[PDB]
Amino acid sequence: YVDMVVNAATMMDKQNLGRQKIGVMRLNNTFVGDRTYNLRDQKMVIP
């Protein structure tokens, strides 16, 4: 009984690679990509 409990206790611990996956996440309340504006000579870019 002891040899059953020990061997069935160390074999549930070992019991208890990853494929790649592409996800598409649509944004409803913002913009992807940068915004650009000018102050009379110079360009400002917001990430």
Binding site: R19, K21, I22, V24, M25, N29
Partner: protein
């Protein structure tokens, strides 16, 4: 895997992100995006 092999590419033609990684890293970025995606309010300055 690591945090350095996740690829994120903007696809502006349908306004969406493209994330490539494992099944646990894709769910990790999807929970971050839904916290940065909120509706804004309007301010009129006079």
């Amino acid at each position: 895997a690591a945090a350095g092999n996740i690829k994120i590419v903007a696809y502006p033609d349908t306004n969406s992100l493209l994330v490539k990684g494992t099944a646990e890293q894709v769910h990790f970025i999807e929970m971050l995006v839904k916290a940065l995606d909120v509706a804004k309010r309007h301010v009129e300055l006079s």
